Every structure is written in structure tokens, then in C-alpha cells.
Design a protein around this motif. Structure first.
Motif, PDB file in Angstrom:
ATOM      1  N   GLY A  20      31.497 -43.148 -63.743  1.00  0.00           N
ATOM      2  CA  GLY A  20      30.226 -42.436 -63.471  1.00  0.00           C
ATOM      3  C   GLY A  20      30.027 -42.316 -61.811  1.00  0.00           C
ATOM      4  O   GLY A  20      29.564 -41.171 -61.162  1.00  0.00           O
ATOM      5  N   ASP A  21      30.630 -43.250 -61.140  1.00  0.00           N
ATOM      6  CA  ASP A  21      30.588 -43.197 -59.774  1.00  0.00           C
ATOM      7  C   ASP A  21      31.959 -43.277 -59.188  1.00  0.00           C
ATOM      8  O   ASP A  21      32.409 -42.637 -58.456  1.00  0.00           O
ATOM      9  CB  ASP A  21      29.722 -44.562 -59.366  1.00  0.00           C
ATOM     10  N   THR A  22      32.493 -44.512 -58.992  1.00  0.00           N
ATOM     11  CA  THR A  22      33.941 -44.540 -58.559  1.00  0.00           C
ATOM     12  C   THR A  22      34.806 -45.952 -59.407  1.00  0.00           C
ATOM     13  O   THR A  22      34.139 -46.724 -60.164  1.00  0.00           O
ATOM     14  CB  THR A  22      33.739 -45.294 -57.154  1.00  0.00           C
ATOM     15  N   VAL A  23      36.057 -45.905 -59.174  1.00  0.00           N
ATOM     16  CA  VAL A  23      36.936 -46.744 -60.126  1.00  0.00           C
ATOM     17  C   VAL A  23      37.798 -47.174 -59.250  1.00  0.00           C
ATOM     18  O   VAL A  23      38.237 -46.440 -58.101  1.00  0.00           O
ATOM     19  CB  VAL A  23      37.647 -45.870 -61.294  1.00  0.00           C
ATOM     20  N   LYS A  24      38.526 -48.389 -59.479  1.00  0.00           N
ATOM     21  CA  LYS A  24      39.562 -48.986 -58.735  1.00  0.00           C
ATOM     22  C   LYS A  24      40.451 -49.925 -59.557  1.00  0.00           C
ATOM     23  O   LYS A  24      40.206 -50.677 -60.651  1.00  0.00           O
ATOM     24  CB  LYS A  24      38.921 -50.129 -58.042  1.00  0.00           C
ATOM     25  N   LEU A  25      41.792 -49.547 -59.178  1.00  0.00           N
ATOM     26  CA  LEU A  25      42.750 -50.135 -59.922  1.00  0.00           C
ATOM     27  C   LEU A  25      43.466 -51.384 -59.386  1.00  0.00           C
ATOM     28  O   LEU A  25      43.356 -51.625 -58.174  1.00  0.00           O
ATOM     29  CB  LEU A  25      44.009 -48.884 -60.212  1.00  0.00           C
ATOM     30  N   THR A  41      27.117 -31.144 -54.837  1.00  0.00           N
ATOM     31  CA  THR A  41      27.087 -29.783 -55.218  1.00  0.00           C
ATOM     32  C   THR A  41      25.306 -29.461 -55.450  1.00  0.00           C
ATOM     33  O   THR A  41      24.806 -29.854 -56.494  1.00  0.00           O
ATOM     34  CB  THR A  41      27.791 -29.622 -56.589  1.00  0.00           C
ATOM     35  N   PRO A  42      24.879 -28.830 -54.658  1.00  0.00           N
ATOM     36  CA  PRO A  42      23.389 -28.444 -54.893  1.00  0.00           C
ATOM     37  C   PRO A  42      23.078 -27.480 -56.095  1.00  0.00           C
ATOM     38  O   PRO A  42      22.068 -27.511 -56.535  1.00  0.00           O
ATOM     39  CB  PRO A  42      22.995 -27.408 -53.688  1.00  0.00           C
ATOM     40  N   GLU A  43      24.140 -26.628 -56.769  1.00  0.00           N
ATOM     41  CA  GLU A  43      24.366 -25.719 -57.783  1.00  0.00           C
ATOM     42  C   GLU A  43      25.058 -26.370 -58.809  1.00  0.00           C
ATOM     43  O   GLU A  43      25.885 -25.462 -59.332  1.00  0.00           O
ATOM     44  CB  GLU A  43      24.505 -24.220 -57.273  1.00  0.00           C
ATOM     45  N   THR A  44      25.160 -27.695 -59.095  1.00  0.00           N
ATOM     46  CA  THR A  44      25.894 -28.098 -60.121  1.00  0.00           C
ATOM     47  C   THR A  44      25.512 -29.609 -60.415  1.00  0.00           C
ATOM     48  O   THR A  44      25.590 -29.783 -61.821  1.00  0.00           O
ATOM     49  CB  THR A  44      27.603 -28.124 -59.457  1.00  0.00           C
ATOM     50  N   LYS A  45      25.275 -30.296 -59.547  1.00  0.00           N
ATOM     51  CA  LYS A  45      24.703 -31.773 -59.679  1.00  0.00           C
ATOM     52  C   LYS A  45      23.588 -31.520 -60.471  1.00  0.00           C
ATOM     53  O   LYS A  45      22.388 -31.505 -60.289  1.00  0.00           O
ATOM     54  CB  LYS A  45      24.328 -32.471 -58.414  1.00  0.00           C
ATOM     55  N   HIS A  46      23.730 -31.842 -62.127  1.00  0.00           N
ATOM     56  CA  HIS A  46      22.804 -31.859 -62.929  1.00  0.00           C
ATOM     57  C   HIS A  46      22.393 -33.096 -63.514  1.00  0.00           C
ATOM     58  O   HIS A  46      23.337 -34.117 -63.745  1.00  0.00           O
ATOM     59  CB  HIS A  46      22.871 -30.812 -64.173  1.00  0.00           C
ATOM     60  N   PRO A  47      21.151 -33.701 -63.873  1.00  0.00           N
ATOM     61  CA  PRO A  47      20.775 -34.973 -64.432  1.00  0.00           C
ATOM     62  C   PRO A  47      21.160 -35.131 -65.943  1.00  0.00           C
ATOM     63  O   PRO A  47      21.687 -36.202 -66.458  1.00  0.00           O
ATOM     64  CB  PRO A  47      19.233 -34.762 -64.313  1.00  0.00           C
ATOM     65  N   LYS A  48      21.403 -33.951 -66.538  1.00  0.00           N
ATOM     66  CA  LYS A  48      21.822 -33.992 -68.000  1.00  0.00           C
ATOM     67  C   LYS A  48      23.240 -34.370 -68.018  1.00  0.00           C
ATOM     68  O   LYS A  48      23.696 -35.309 -68.705  1.00  0.00           O
ATOM     69  CB  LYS A  48      21.421 -32.794 -68.615  1.00  0.00           C
ATOM     70  N   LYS A  49      24.120 -33.591 -67.442  1.00  0.00           N
ATOM     71  CA  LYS A  49      25.553 -33.913 -67.482  1.00  0.00           C
ATOM     72  C   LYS A  49      25.988 -34.838 -66.451  1.00  0.00           C
ATOM     73  O   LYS A  49      26.795 -35.764 -66.638  1.00  0.00           O
ATOM     74  CB  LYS A  49      26.239 -32.619 -67.014  1.00  0.00           C
ATOM     75  N   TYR A  54      28.162 -34.637 -69.586  1.00  0.00           N
ATOM     76  CA  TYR A  54      26.904 -35.638 -70.200  1.00  0.00           C
ATOM     77  C   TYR A  54      26.990 -36.778 -69.253  1.00  0.00           C
ATOM     78  O   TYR A  54      25.905 -37.398 -68.755  1.00  0.00           O
ATOM     79  CB  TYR A  54      27.352 -36.169 -71.259  1.00  0.00           C
ATOM     80  N   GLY A  55      28.217 -37.210 -68.411  1.00  0.00           N
ATOM     81  CA  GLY A  55      28.108 -37.941 -67.409  1.00  0.00           C
ATOM     82  C   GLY A  55      28.467 -39.558 -68.097  1.00  0.00           C
ATOM     83  O   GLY A  55      29.721 -39.707 -68.114  1.00  0.00           O
ATOM     84  N   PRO A  56      27.502 -40.398 -68.208  1.00  0.00           N
ATOM     85  CA  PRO A  56      27.653 -41.606 -68.561  1.00  0.00           C
ATOM     86  C   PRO A  56      28.460 -41.775 -69.737  1.00  0.00           C
ATOM     87  O   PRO A  56      29.246 -42.935 -70.340  1.00  0.00           O
ATOM     88  CB  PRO A  56      26.336 -42.254 -68.911  1.00  0.00           C
ATOM     89  N   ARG A 105      40.009 -34.627 -70.816  1.00  0.00           N
ATOM     90  CA  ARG A 105      40.710 -33.195 -71.052  1.00  0.00           C
ATOM     91  C   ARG A 105      39.829 -32.362 -71.430  1.00  0.00           C
ATOM     92  O   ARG A 105      39.833 -30.973 -71.495  1.00  0.00           O
ATOM     93  CB  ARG A 105      42.003 -33.363 -71.305  1.00  0.00           C
ATOM     94  N   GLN A 106      38.449 -32.693 -72.084  1.00  0.00           N
ATOM     95  CA  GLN A 106      37.800 -31.886 -72.816  1.00  0.00           C
ATOM     96  C   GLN A 106      36.608 -31.507 -71.926  1.00  0.00           C
ATOM     97  O   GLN A 106      35.545 -30.873 -72.249  1.00  0.00           O
ATOM     98  CB  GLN A 106      37.161 -32.664 -74.122  1.00  0.00           C
ATOM     99  N   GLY A 107      36.926 -31.885 -70.644  1.00  0.00           N
ATOM    100  CA  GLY A 107      35.519 -31.474 -69.623  1.00  0.00           C
ATOM    101  C   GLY A 107      34.738 -32.587 -69.120  1.00  0.00           C
ATOM    102  O   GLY A 107      33.839 -32.521 -69.071  1.00  0.00           O
ATOM    103  N   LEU A 108      35.484 -33.940 -69.399  1.00  0.00           N
ATOM    104  CA  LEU A 108      34.475 -35.076 -68.939  1.00  0.00           C
ATOM    105  C   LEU A 108      33.270 -35.273 -69.833  1.00  0.00           C
ATOM    106  O   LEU A 108      32.400 -34.616 -69.756  1.00  0.00           O
ATOM    107  CB  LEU A 108      34.464 -35.106 -67.657  1.00  0.00           C
ATOM    108  N   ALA A 109      33.416 -36.269 -70.892  1.00  0.00           N
ATOM    109  CA  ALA A 109      32.287 -36.466 -71.543  1.00  0.00           C
ATOM    110  C   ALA A 109      32.315 -35.559 -72.820  1.00  0.00           C
ATOM    111  O   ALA A 109      32.607 -35.841 -74.030  1.00  0.00           O
ATOM    112  CB  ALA A 109      30.999 -36.392 -70.895  1.00  0.00           C
ATOM    113  N   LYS A 110      32.204 -34.402 -72.785  1.00  0.00           N
ATOM    114  CA  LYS A 110      32.222 -33.238 -73.655  1.00  0.00           C
ATOM    115  C   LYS A 110      31.263 -33.761 -75.129  1.00  0.00           C
ATOM    116  O   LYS A 110      31.847 -34.370 -75.883  1.00  0.00           O
ATOM    117  CB  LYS A 110      33.647 -32.913 -74.153  1.00  0.00           C
TER     118      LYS A 110
END
Length: 110
Positions: A20-25, A41-49, A54-56, A105-110
Motif C-alpha cells: 500500500g505504501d512501499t516495498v523493499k527486497l 493524483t488529485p483526480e485519482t487518489k480515492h479513499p475507497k480504492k 481497493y488498496g489494502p 494483473r487484475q488492476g491491483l486488488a480487483k
């Protein structure tokens, strides 16, 4: 003229991927991150996704792909570690399979 294409399978698993934030290998002790917090993104950053759908959600799925599913490896011996994003792109094959193709590949979360 001709380039060499060789792939060496080396054990590489994330120590703590937030997704959801960052990842390290963890590769040879080198902190190789995979995709960082892009531009706001002012016209993309949504709380739902949150990020894509979905995000998380997509994060939780990947959260296991690294925590419990520690069967990822680096399938690429090109030698180049930075050039695309600056060490943000790394081949991830968890459990003999890719994670980006699983649910990402399903659009992250889906």
C-alpha cells in the motif's frame, strides 16, 4: 551487434512489503525497492480504492506473498540494477510463479 541474455535464479525475498505504501527486497544485502509512492493524483487518489481498486486488498495478498510465501527469486542476470526506474524494477517469482501476474494483473486488488 549482439547482446547476451542470461538469467540466474537466486533466492530473493522481501523482508517487509507494505505494498500500500512501499516495498523493499533483499538481494545480496542490497535494499532493492519495487515501485515507490508515485506522484499525487488529485483526480485519482480515492479513499475507497486507495491505489488502484481497493488498496489494502492487493496489499494483503502480496503481504503474504512475501511474509509467508517467501519463495521468491531473481530471474535475471542482465547485470543492470538501475536504468529503468532506479532500482525499482525487479523480477519477482514467488513460489515458482510471478506475483504481478497473480492478482496485480487484475488492476491491483480487483
Amino acid at each position: 551487434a549482439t547482446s547476451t541474455k542470461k538469467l540466474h535464479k537466486e533466492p530473493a525475498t522481501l523482508i517487509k512489503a507494505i505494498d500500500g505504501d512501499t516495498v523493499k527486497l533483499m538481494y545480496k544485502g542490497q535494499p532493492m525497492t519495487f515501485r515507490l509512492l508515485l506522484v499525487d493524483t488529485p483526480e485519482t487518489k480515492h479513499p475507497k480504492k486507495g491505489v488502484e481498486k481497493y488498496g489494502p486488498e492487493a496489499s494483503a495478498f502480496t503481504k503474504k506473498m512475501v511474509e509467508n510465501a517467501k519463495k521468491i527469486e531473481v530471474e535475471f542476470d542482465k547485470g543492470q540494477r538501475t536504468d529503468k526506474y532506479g532500482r525499482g524494477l525487479a523480477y519477482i517469482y514467488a513460489d515458482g510463479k510471478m506475483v504481478n501476474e497473480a492478482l496485480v494483473r487484475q488492476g491491483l486488488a480487483k
